[PDB]
Amino acid sequence: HNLSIDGQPLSLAIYAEPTDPKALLTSMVQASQGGSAVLPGTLSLYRFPVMLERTRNLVAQLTQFGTSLLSMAEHDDADELTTLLLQQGMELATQSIRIQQRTVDEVDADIAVLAESRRSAQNRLEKYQQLYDEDINHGEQRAMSL
Amino acid sequence: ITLSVFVISSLYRLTLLARVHQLTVNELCMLYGLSPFNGKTTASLSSGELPRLVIWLYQVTQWLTEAEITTEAIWLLCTPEFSGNISPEISNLLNNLRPSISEDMAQSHNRELQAEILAPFIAATLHLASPDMARYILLWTDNLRPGGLDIAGFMTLVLKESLNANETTQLVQFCHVMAQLSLSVQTLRLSEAELSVLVISGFAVLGAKNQPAGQHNIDTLFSLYRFHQWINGLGNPGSDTLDMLRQQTLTADRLASVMGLDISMVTQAMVSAGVNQLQCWQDINTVLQWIDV
Amino acid sequence: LPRLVIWLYQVTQWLTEAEITTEAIWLLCTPEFSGNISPEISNLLNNLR
Amino acid sequence: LRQQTLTADRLASVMGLDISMVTQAMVSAGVNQLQCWQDINTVLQWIDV
Amino acid sequence: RREAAQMQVEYQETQQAHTQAQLELLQRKFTNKALYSWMRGKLSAIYYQFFDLTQSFCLMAQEALRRELTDNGVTFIRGGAWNGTTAGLMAGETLLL
Amino acid sequence: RREAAQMQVEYQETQQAHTQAQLELLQRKFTNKALYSWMRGKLSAIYY
Amino acid sequence: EADGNTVSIDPDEEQSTFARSALMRGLGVNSGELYQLGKLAGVLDAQNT
Numbered sequence: 001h002n003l004s005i006d007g008q009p010l011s012l013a014i015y016a017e018p019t020d021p022k023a024l025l026t027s028m029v030q031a032s033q034g035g036s037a038v039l040p041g042t043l044s045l046y047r048f049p050v051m052l053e054r055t056r057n058l059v060a061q062l063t064q065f066g067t068s069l070l071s072m073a074e075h076d077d078a079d080e081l082t083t084l085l086l087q088q089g090m091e092l093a094t095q096s097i098r099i100q101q102r103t104v105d106e107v108d109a110d111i112a113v114l115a116e117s118r119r120s121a122q123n124r125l126e127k128y129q130q131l132y133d134e135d136i137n138h139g140e141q142r143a144m145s146l
Numbered sequence: 147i148t149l150s151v152f153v154i155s156s157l158y159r160l161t162l163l164a165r166v167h168q169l170t171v172n173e174l175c176m177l178y179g180l181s182p183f184n185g186k187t188t189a190s191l192s193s194g195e196l197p198r199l200v201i202w203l204y205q206v207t208q209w210l211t212e213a214e215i216t217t218e219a220i221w222l223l224c225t226p227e228f229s230g231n232i233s234p235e236i237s238n239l240l241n242n243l244r245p246s247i248s249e250d251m252a253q254s255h256n257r258e259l260q261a262e263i264l265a266p267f268i269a270a271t272l273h274l275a276s277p278d279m280a281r282y283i284l285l286w287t288d289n290l291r292p293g294g295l296d297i298a299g300f301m302t303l304v305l306k307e308s309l310n311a312n313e314t315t316q317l318v319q320f321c322h323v324m325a326q327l328s329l330s331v332q333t334l335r336l337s338e339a340e341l342s343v344l345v346i347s348g349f350a351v352l353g354a355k356n357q358p359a360g361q362h363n364i365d366t367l368f369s370l371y372r373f374h375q376w377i378n379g380l381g382n383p384g385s386d387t388l389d390m391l392r393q394q395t396l397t398a399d400r401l402a403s404v405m406g407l408d409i410s411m412v413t414q415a416m417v418s419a420g421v422n423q424l425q426c427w428q429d430i431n432t433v434l435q436w437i438d439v
Numbered sequence: 440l441p442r443l444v445i446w447l448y449q450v451t452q453w454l455t456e457a458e459i460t461t462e463a464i465w466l467l468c469t470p471e472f473s474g475n476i477s478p479e480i481s482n483l484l485n486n487l488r
Numbered sequence: 489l490r491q492q493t494l495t496a497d498r499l500a501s502v503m504g505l506d507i508s509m510v511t512q513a514m515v516s517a518g519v520n521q522l523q524c525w526q527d528i529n530t531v532l533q534w535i536d537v
Numbered sequence: 538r539r540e541a542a543q544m545q546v547e548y549q550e551t552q553q554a555h556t557q558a559q560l561e562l563l564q565r566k567f568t569n570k571a572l573y574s575w576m577r578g579k580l581s582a583i584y585y586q587f588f589d590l591t592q593s594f595c596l597m598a599q600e601a602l603r604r605e606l607t608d609n610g611v612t613f614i615r616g617g618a619w620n621g622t623t624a625g626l627m628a629g630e631t632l633l634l
Numbered sequence: 635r636r637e638a639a640q641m642q643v644e645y646q647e648t649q650q651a652h653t654q655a656q657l658e659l660l661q662r663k664f665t666n667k668a669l670y671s672w673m674r675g676k677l678s679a680i681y682y
Numbered sequence: 683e684a685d686g687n688t689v690s691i692d693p694d695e696e697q698s699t700f701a702r703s704a705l706m707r708g709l710g711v712n713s714g715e716l717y718q719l720g721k722l723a724g725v726l727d728a729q730n731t
Contacts, residue, residue, distance in 0.1 A: 026378050026658045030385045030668060031339035032478040033621030035485060038614055041596025048605045051598040056633075058591045063629035065584045069577065070626060070665070076573040077663050079563075083570075084659055086560045088652040093553040095645050100549050102638040104542045111539065172506065218504060227501070231493055242575070246582055266585065270578025273570060275664045276624060277581050335658055339478075382466070386477040395475060403471070406462060410693045410714035482622050486676070622672040624664075630680050 156189045163200065167207045173217040177206060180224050180364045209368055215333060223330050224364050228322040232314055236321050239271040243304055252301035260297045261285050272328040279338045282345045283328050289348065289360055290327075293319035327362060334371055339385065343392050344370075351392055353426030373427045376434070380404060396424045401433075411437055494522045499531075509535055588619055588628050595632050691720050692730035 002010050044051050147153050164174040178184060183191070183199050191199065210220060243264070251263060261284040262277075269280035288297045293316035295303070303310065303317050310317065331341060344352055349360035352373060360366075377384050383404050390396045401424060402412040415436040416422065421429040454464060499522060500510040513534040514520070519527040563569070595614050603609050618631040660666070689701040693713035706716050720726045 024379075024654060025381065026654070026661055027381050027384050028661050028666070028668060029337045029339040029377060029388065030478055030482070031342045032389070032481045033485075035617035035621065036592075036619040038592070038596065038616040041593070041600045041614075043600050043604070044597045046601070048598065048601045051594075051601045055591070055594040055598045058587075058594050059629050059632045062584070062587050062591045063633065065580065065587060066626045066629050069580050069584060072573060072577045072580065073665050075568075076570070076577065077665050079570060079573065080663075081656075081659065083560070083563060084656065086556060086563065088655070089556050090553065090560070091648065092645070092652075093549065093556055095641065095648065097546065097549045097553065099638055099641050099645065100542070100546045102641065104539065104546060106635055106638065107539045107542050172504070229498065231491075238575075242579070246586075262585075266578045266581035269581070270574045273574050275662065277578075278621070278624065335662060337662055383473070385479065386473050386475060389478050390473070390475055393475075400473065408714040408718070410717055411712075414693065482672075485617070486620060486622065486672070488617075620672075620676075623669060623676065626673055627676045627680070630677060634680050 152189075160188060163203060167203050169207065169217065174203075176217060176221045176225075177203060180221070181206075182363075182365065206364065206368070209371070213371065219333070220364065223326055223333065224362070224367070228319055230315060230318060232318055233321075235271055236318065239267060239321075240304055242270075243267050247301065247304065249302075249305055252298060252305050254298075257285070257288060257297050260301060261288070264297070264301070268324070272325060274328055274332075276338065279331070279341065280328075282338070282341045283324060283331065286327055286341075286345050286360075287320065287324045289345075290323060290362060292323035293317075295320045323362070330362070330367060334367070334374060336370065336374055337377075340374060340377060340388070343388055347392060351426060353428035355428060369427065369431075372431065376427075376430070391424070391427075391430075394423075394425065396430075398424065401430070407437060489522070489525075489528075492521070492523060496522065499528070505535060584625060588625065591629075591632060592618065688727065688731040690729060690731045691716050691726075693717050695730075 004010060160174065161171070163169075164171055167174075169177065178188075181199070181202055183195075183202070188196075188199070210217065246267075247263065251260065254260065261281045264284055265277035265281040268274070268284055269277050272280065272283070274280045274283065284297060295316050300317070300320055303313055349366075352366070352369060353359055354361070354366065354369075357365075377388060380387050387396070387400075387404050390400065398412050398416055399409055401407075402409045412433065415433045416424075419429075419432045419436050421432055424430055424433070453459075454461065459467075496510050496514055497507055499505075500507045510531065513531045514522075517527075517530045517534050519530060522528050522531070592614065599612075599614055602613075603611060614632070618628040619625045620627075685701065689699050689705075691702055691705075691713075693716075698713075702713075702716070706712065709716065709719070711719065717730075720730075
């Protein structure tokens with residue numbers, strides 16, 4: 001099977017890395033819209049100038065109504081955008097809290113690594129202290145006396 | 147219950163079906179009630195029906211996770227169960243609507259004109275974008291006839307001096323279904339043009355697999371979501387393609403050119419799928435799935 | 440043939456530099472048209488009449 | 489709740505709980521009708537434990 | 538260092554609570570979504586009725602002008618003042634013109 | 635540390651989906667580009 | 683190439699040819715793209731061969 005004596009493979013594999021992320025887009029969709037129709041009109045009792053004045057006042061008030069409607073729609077839309085932003089901020093805040101918790105766990109793992117390092121150092125210290133205190137052992141002393 | 151392998155295996159199968167899709171037993175019960183398998187006990191499911199249920203659960207849970215819709219949210223969107231008590235929102239709607247409405251308008255025969263009249267108050271009470279969107283929601287609810295009420299019946303019930311004995315049930319059911327449809331549209335972020343085309347066509351543009359078109363269930367909701375995604379992906383010619391689909395002039399060459407596909411691939415996809423004319427979103431979806439595989 | 444290769448290089452380099460996709464530039468310059476009175480045309484005519 | 493029509497089934501359906509759990513909580517707490525926030529709170533605490 | 542990391546966690550938690558408070562204040566605002574929605578629903582219904590009344594006035598004034606000039610062929614209110622492309626806006630400007 | 639990096643990737647993807655939702659809401663807005671364009675076109679003709 | 687015979691590159695052909703498959707794999711295209719290349723190059727013959 002073309003492995004080394006200890007089982008390490010002798011071929012480097014490949015994976016053909018997945019082809020990039022995907023971009024998603026949105027677009028405005030417009031539909032056919034009609035207009036109003038007109039009906040035959042009634043004959044008033046007043047002459048043209050007086051009816052012209054009354055109609056002009058009514059149309060001016062209608063224009064005021066339209067302006068108010070547009071302003072109110074704009075303010076409502078701005079508030080909706082703000083609310084969406086705040087909800088998205090909530091979701092991101094939850095994910096950020098999770099990430100910071102994992103950072104705390106990483107620091108704990110580093111502390112554990114340091115604990116293992118100190119265990120090794122302390123074992124070295126006890127070995128060398130035992131060697132140093134014993135100094136010359138009985139065999140070496142016997143040979144020197146011989 | 148009788149303690150045997152079969153019964154214990156049925157219960158364990160239900161628990162597995164919840165666990166593998168990350169649902170609690172309550173969520174599984176809700177999704178089963180919404181599924182086209184409700185009214186059928188899982189132990190009394192055929193050997194070919196069970197994989198259909200498993201695949202339906204997988205696809206629905208995947209769609210909900212992808213679109214960021216909770217199971218509770220979809221249950222609220224699609225459940226037929228209603229409180230049965232008149233709510234403060236409906237009370238404010240009725241109190242605001244009564245002065246601005248008349249019995250002649252209620253008994254008139256133009257459902258379009260009645261929807262135009264009722265649109266602003268429905269939009270106000272449902273927090274909808276525009277009275278046009280509210281009008282199309284009203285027309286869809288009129289097509290559904292939730293409690294047996296139409297727009298004229300709803301108007302007549304509004305025109306009553308608190309003369310609501312048990313018609314309160316019909317009124318609240320109509321209002322609940324209307325709010326459910328509006329919430330589904332808002333969740334899907336469906337555009338007013340798409341809603342207008344679909345409602346005017348009676349959901350024949352959307353289509354339905356072996357079902358009557360236009361029903362409000364989770365399957366038609368998923369189809370609407372996919373159709374909206376395709377329309378969004380079409381780009382600038384999206385409106386013209388939607389108009390051609392509202393008409394019956396959408397052709398394979400036009401679809402291929404719009405979507406950027408190869409005409410030979412699209413033609414072979416239609417021939418393999420067995421669809422000869424791109425009449426509806428069902429046919430378009432089938433062709434696109436064949437192209438996908 | 441070298442003229443075609445040079446033109447192709449010029450156009451692709453320009454599209455990359457100016458950030459215009461090939462689909463977008465084909466939509467900009469193609470003579471092919473849908474052939475249907477789209478809703479935008481319908482609204483324009485109804486507002487213009 | 490402002491009226492006196494709030495029932496155990498409606499409370500369970502609204503809060504997402506199980507109807508058996510809510511009924512058992514009411515029986516254990518000794519409250520028979522969800523008349524006020526005190527009763528609702530007691531039932532919810534029994535469900536919590 | 539571990540203490541610093543834990544206090545960073547608490548900082549994130551405080552930020553999340555702050556966003557909650559902002560959302561709740563936005564919802565308890567006086568000029569909130571419900572107020573704006575009801576206001577524009579009322580104004581839309583009022584505008585719809587007022588356009589009908591105003592167009593009736595315009596038509597009867599046009600009839601007065603036709604009578605004055607003895608020319609029944611003049612037409613000025615051509616319809617389409619209330620167009621769907623703008624949700625009924627600019628009807629007043631059209632009628633003023 | 636690798637787990638933390640992967641959740642950072644998911645954070646970026648969530649941010650991208652958030653900007654997509656913002657753009658879609660802007661386009662489904664009532665006072666959107668099409669509404670403003672038609673309103674000022676009509677008003678410009680009327681003004682002329 | 684020591685073939686000299688005619689192979690049909692029509693995508694709509696039942697029971698395709700080994701020569702067509704090998705040409706497609708060598709060029710790194712599918713049947714539709716091979717048909718596009720044949721049309722663009724004008725090497726096409728009668729019966730789309």
